[PDB]
Amino acid sequence: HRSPGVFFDSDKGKTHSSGKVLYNARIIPYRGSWLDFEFDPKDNLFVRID
């Protein structure tokens, strides 16, 4: 399985069809609720908690 920690990803940069690469960060604990950070195509910091 995936080790708990912090992982940064770019989702291959093909989601909005504009060629803009989107970076996201995930915090995964061994037990608990996940925490997430995401980039909007308008460059806005958004979180996705649980």
* Least distance between DNA and beta carbon 38 (Å): 10
Residue appearing with tokens 């399985």: 1
Whole-angstrom distance, CA of residue 9 vs CA of residue 24: 6
Written as one letter, the residue type at 43 is: D
- Under the rule (CB under 7 A), what is the footprint of DNA? 1-2, 16, 18, 32-34, 40-41, 50
Q: Which is nearer to DNA, 5 or 41 (CB)?
A: 41
Q: Which is nearer to DNA, 6 or 18 (CB)?
A: 18
Number of neighbouring beta carbons within 10 Å of residue 40: 11
Written as one letter, the residue type at 11 is: D
* Least distance between DNA and beta carbon 1 (Å): 5
